[PDB]
Amino acid sequence: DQICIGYHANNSTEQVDTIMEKNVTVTHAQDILEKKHNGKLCDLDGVKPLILRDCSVAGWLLGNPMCDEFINVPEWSYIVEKANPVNDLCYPGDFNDYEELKHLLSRINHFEKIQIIPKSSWSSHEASLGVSSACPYQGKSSFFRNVVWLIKKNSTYPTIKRSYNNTNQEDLLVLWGIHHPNDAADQTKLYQNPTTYISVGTSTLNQRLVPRIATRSKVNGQSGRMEFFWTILKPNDAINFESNGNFIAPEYAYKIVKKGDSTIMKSELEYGNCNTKCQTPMGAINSSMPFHNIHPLTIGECPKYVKSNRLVLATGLRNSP
Amino acid sequence: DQICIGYHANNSTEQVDTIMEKNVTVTHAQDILEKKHNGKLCDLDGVKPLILRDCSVAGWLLGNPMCDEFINVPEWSYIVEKANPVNDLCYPGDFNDYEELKHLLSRINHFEKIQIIPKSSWSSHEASLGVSSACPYQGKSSFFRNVVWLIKKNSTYPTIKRSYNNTNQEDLLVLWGIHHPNDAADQTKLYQNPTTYISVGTSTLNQRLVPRIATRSKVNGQSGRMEFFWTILKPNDAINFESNGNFIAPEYAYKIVKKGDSTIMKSELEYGNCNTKCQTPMGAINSSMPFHNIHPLTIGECPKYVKSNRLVLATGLRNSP
Amino acid sequence: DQICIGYHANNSTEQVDTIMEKNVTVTHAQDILEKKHNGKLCDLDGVKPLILRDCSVAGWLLGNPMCDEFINVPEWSYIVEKANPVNDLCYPGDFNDYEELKHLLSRINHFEKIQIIPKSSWSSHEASLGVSSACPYQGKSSFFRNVVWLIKKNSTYPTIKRSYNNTNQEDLLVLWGIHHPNDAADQTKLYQNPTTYISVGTSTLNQRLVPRIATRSKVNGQSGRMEFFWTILKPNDAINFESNGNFIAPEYAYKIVKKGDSTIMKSELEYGNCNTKCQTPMGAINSSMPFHNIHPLTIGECPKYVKSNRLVLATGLRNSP
Amino acid sequence: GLFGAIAGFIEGGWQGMVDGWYGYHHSNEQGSGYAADKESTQKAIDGVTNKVNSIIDKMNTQFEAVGREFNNLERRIENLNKKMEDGFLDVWTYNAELLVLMENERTLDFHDSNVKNLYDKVRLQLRDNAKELGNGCFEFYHKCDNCMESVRNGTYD
Amino acid sequence: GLFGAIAGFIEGGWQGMVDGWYGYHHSNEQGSGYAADKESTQKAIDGVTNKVNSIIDKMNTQFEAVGREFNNLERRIENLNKKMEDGFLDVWTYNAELLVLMENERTLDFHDSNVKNLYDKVRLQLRDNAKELGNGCFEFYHKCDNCMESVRNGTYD
Amino acid sequence: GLFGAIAGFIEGGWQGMVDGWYGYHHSNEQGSGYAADKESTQKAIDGVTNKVNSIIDKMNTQFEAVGREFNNLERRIENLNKKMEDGFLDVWTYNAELLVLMENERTLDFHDSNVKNLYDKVRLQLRDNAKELGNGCFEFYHKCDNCMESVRNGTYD
Numbered sequence A, B, C: 001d002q003i004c005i006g007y008h009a010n011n012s013t014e015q016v017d018t019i020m021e022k023n024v025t026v027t028h029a030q031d032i033l034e035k036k037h038n039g040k041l042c043d044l045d046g047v048k049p050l051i052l053r054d055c056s057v058a059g060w061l062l063g064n065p066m067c068d069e070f071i072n073v074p075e076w077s078y079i080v081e082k083a084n085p086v087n088d089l090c091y092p093g094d095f096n097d098y099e100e101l102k103h104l105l106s107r108i109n110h111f112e113k114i115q116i117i118p119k120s121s122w123s124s125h126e127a128s129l130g131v132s133s134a135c136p137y138q139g140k141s142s143f144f145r146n147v148v149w150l151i152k153k154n155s156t157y158p159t160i161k162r163s164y165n166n167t168n169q170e171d172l173l174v175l176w177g178i179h180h181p182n183d184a185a186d187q188t189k190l191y192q193n194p195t196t197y198i199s200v201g202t203s204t205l206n207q208r209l210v211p212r213i214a215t216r217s218k219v220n221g222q223s224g225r226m227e228f229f230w231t232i233l234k235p236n237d238a239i240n241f242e243s244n245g246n247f248i249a250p251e252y253a254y255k256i257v258k259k260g261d262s263t264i265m266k267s268e269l270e271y272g273n274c275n276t277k278c279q280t281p282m283g284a285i286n287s288s289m290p291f292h293n294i295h296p297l298t299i300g301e302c303p304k305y306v307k308s309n310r311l312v313l314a315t316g317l318r319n320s321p
Numbered sequence D, E, F: 001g002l003f004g005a006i007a008g009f010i011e012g013g014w015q016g017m018v019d020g021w022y023g024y025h026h027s028n029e030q031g032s033g034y035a036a037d038k039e040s041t042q043k044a045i046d047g048v049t050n051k052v053n054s055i056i057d058k059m060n061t062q063f064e065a066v067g068r069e070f071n072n073l074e075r076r077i078e079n080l081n082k083k084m085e086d087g088f089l090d091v092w093t094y095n096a097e098l099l100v101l102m103e104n105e106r107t108l109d110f111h112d113s114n115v116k117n118l119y120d121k122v123r124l125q126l127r128d129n130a131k132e133l134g135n136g137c138f139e140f141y142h143k144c145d146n147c148m149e150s151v152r153n154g155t156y157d
């Protein structure tokens, strides 16, 4: 007669690592890394992301005519943009402080677009003729929808003196621009006056832009350049334009409504018709693992990202062979 | 007859945590987190901090007339500024590269203020009349003390050509500015000439400022703007001004004396009449704990900051119930 | 008769540390920190570093005449520059966006220098006379080799309109500059015209420089200033200059050939005639230790840098006394 | 293993004890079988659950990459931004992998410790009555009736 | 506990031993009492003091936030600055909390280890003379006179 | 040491065992000598080698300073850059120093654990035949012939 102390074995095949030994076989184990996504872009908590397709944030905000999809967008969860979106800045140039604006967009969930200076508000200048081959729409030459390319009326560009007061309760993103022609004859052809300027004023802004003449390579068949600036007009604050040419003038501005945490993710992917609680640039995540290894940039209720290939905790004991 | 091996219990109530078990009761324990401050701003090692009250570093350095407290300050340990100090930049505008200057102030313990261009040094221009409603002093219109608002003398603003050589052995903080009026008639009223400039030169500096005209919102009842620039004039180096108007000219500059490690902390708090060896934005610290959890930004002999609520080391053994 | 269990002692003197006890003597130990270098600058994997001696990257790239050593350099592994190289910018001024360029150099292993605008290409302007006392060569006044100091021909500075197209397959570093004189009479003496400009154009660049007049301290016996700008001209892209004076014009540009990972290290040291697989600013490393403590900035197959003085692992057991 | 029991003087585990992690095998005239020791098993289950949760918990404070973009002439701050984001990921990857490695080894040792303790608890009861065979088993001097229930009991002699 | 002594086969500690951390209780005709084992107690005190100081020491190299300000159009570098300062605080908070957790558990185990070792040191002396009761106590075959001093001594038989 | 063997009940090591890390000393009429226990020695060597390599391995993912320069009016980002580079070095210096400290202590304990286990393996064979002297040695009841080979063997009685 005999009594024995002993312990559990089973038919487990699960292995875990220790400092002193690798692939120890254990009775029980708890894998804590999520390794699987669904490879789609999904709604986040029911809320759909703004998917720019071939449009850049710039293409969207200025209203490139090929970006008609995003003329009026509902509230979004997060924004997706490609690495190299084609429909950006159709008339070539720059967007001043673009990245800082993109940064601001990351704390924004809804813009409501409103008209601040009506296109048919211009008495002394031509406003229907500010178009280009670089921004085609339905075959014909067209321009960014949100800004007005002002031109001389019957050979005269009189000084413009326009003001807009923010009666809204929401911060206003206000967008404008300046045109840099290639030579003096272009300057005369559109605006007449040889030297011009645009001054922009607000409580905090003290701006004066001046056209930069240079001969340059045709980007998109144009050698001219548009350079776009912006400001956040506070409530009860007035923006003051004054200019004698080259002025690209606001028609529409964006009310900032319902700003909430959000991000712009970079992804060649397209919308997936799904819902998720945690999204990544490569796909969405559904898991209760404390960690995942999918991609560092997530948004939502997400597990923590690590660069591991494997994280498995022993819970049972060493399984005998 | 019997002999027994055994161990200590006591009436300890102290608990510590382990990976496998929480709130284990121990005979002895060593709490290593400092959780207590005094909630005051105190002298640091006898040395008093510069407390700006309602003045900003800008309000102080330019000598806003409401910042008379800080006309001549002794050596400080650290600087305290509020989140939103009221007495800043009374005449509206900007302070060029302000943050970089604040950064420099963090390696500075004492400024000694000295006159470089005497106010009664101006023959051909009016110097007693450069005042404004935006900077009141004792009811009457006044201006930043340290800089001179130069005006035309009997309808003429002749070119100014002034130089100052640093004979001192200490680096010199030199401060000046430019005025941007709202319209052409303001330009004429004060300086006469229609287009002006200010050029500033030194060994390393190659500056030319030009007035920016715009109509803008009244900030502090003024639509004009002052924009302040600065340089560190090296020893045995000469600063060279030349300007035909809009020039806000230095009367006083600051010798950098006794620069030592220091910081600007943000705090709504006021001076506490105490001494300490370690100070935080919320209060001072007196402790021998290797860690504290008070605030990340300290100055002095300080314990290390952690975000814990509790750090207690077991020293005794598990106390029996 | 007796049998005993026991363990190894030896005459080891090696000590290691534990959490509970310091300097425990062990039978065996494995030191894992490399503490030794050779104190030289060596070739990296056979490949020699570009050692600028007394030249700065600026002195090199613009071709300061005292930097003749580096007129045509072979492929390098890494670059060495002193803390304060003497032969930099002999004619005083600035180098616009210098640090960003240095950053670019860190992803570059070979430049091949080629002539884009031949010096004897200038019909209407004087090109042999753009020299200075600040840049001497073999006793006589000389100028940066790579750029041409254009001057008026028989009292006329006609507008320059020059273009260069990148037919090469490699990105082109293109370098140019502008001259800022001290007074109006200097402006007339060299270029005649009172107000000038330089406009630079490319696919992406939209530049217009304008001379900044100021009286300033003589740095290197000159009060004038050269300010150097640069661009990376993409392949199949054209750079377009236009200027009526103050223009410092490119004669040579650099093809970017064989860009590979590399760095600029700061070191007062000079070349050591050695080879290595891992180099530091203080000396090279030859070791199989997983860590070293030499300097944080290495290049090559390198152990990991830690700030320790000692890292020794126990392998044997506690050696008895 | 540090405690010498698991894959030590006790050569291997038991497929036949599906009951819990540690226990007894008895064998006498009336037969033979396995019974789990409820107390040590339950102590073990809590130890490990708490550990796991502690491990998960300490790991939720962790770096969270935020996307940021930089123009063509901000290459230095973009590189700064990159090396910072990667550095915190390398630090947390290292943290999690090591913690796992170290705690796995403490987990296997803890089970080994529980087996030895349970064994000793039985050694301390049978002290001269049975012969300590050397393999986890004790062989009785006097035949033990299903007496076994009493060894498992804590109440024997 | 891994060593099975503390709150193990020795059920609980002794309010009556104010003397040191581990020792003896004796009981015979002449009476009874507690005496601390000076050597193991002192070894234990050094172990733990050194540990604490080692813990404090390794913790003084640590991130120190420096205040930095950024204008309205530097929102990205300000955010960079923030996430960097927080990241190092999360890394050091995690460091200190874990080190505490792990070292606390090694501290309790070390005391358990010291009790077992002291017990074994006495088991190894009384080997057939007294009956190993199973509870930390040995019951003598032959009556022991204040003989006790000799068990504590290291010099018995 | 936690296991009580090394510099414990076994007072010190043996200069005369150059053979391996743990083993036996025997002494009888035919003489005396040292022989290493091959199995436990080899187990120990693998344990430690693996540990060392694991230690080296986990340490190659680590911060790598990249040099970056900043002009005179970028003092804030230069300081940011500095505190970031130093912070990661302090975090990795702390990592390596601690890992070394902790793993050194597990290494010494592991050897102590191996000695105790080997001792117990011999205690479990000689159980009533020899007298457990208390010092790592067993003294035989019956004289043992070079019988010794059989204790070392695992095959005795």
Ligand SMILES: *[C@@H]1O[C@H](CO)[C@@H](O)[C@H](O)[C@H]1NC(C)=O
Pocket: A217, A218, C165, C166, C167, C236, C237, C238
């Ligand atoms: C540059 O020159 C190449 C070679 O002829 C030409 O193919 C290319 O189109 C040119 N680009 C421009 C912008 O002139």
Ligand SMILES: *[C@@H]1O[C@H](CO)[C@@H](O)[C@H](O)[C@H]1NC(C)=O
Pocket: A165, A166, A167, A236, A237, A238, B217, B218
């Ligand atoms: C802007 O318009 C509002 C509405 O009348 C007015 O109350 C506010 O004072 C105005 N602000 C300025 C600067 O004109």
Ligand SMILES: *[C@@H]1O[C@H](CO)[C@@H](O)[C@H](O)[C@H]1NC(C)=O
Pocket: B165, B166, B167, B236, B237, B238, C217, C218
């Ligand atoms: C500045 O003045 C000092 C004092 O005479 C003189 O030695 C120094 O050379 C001057 N520097 C310049 C640039 O004028």
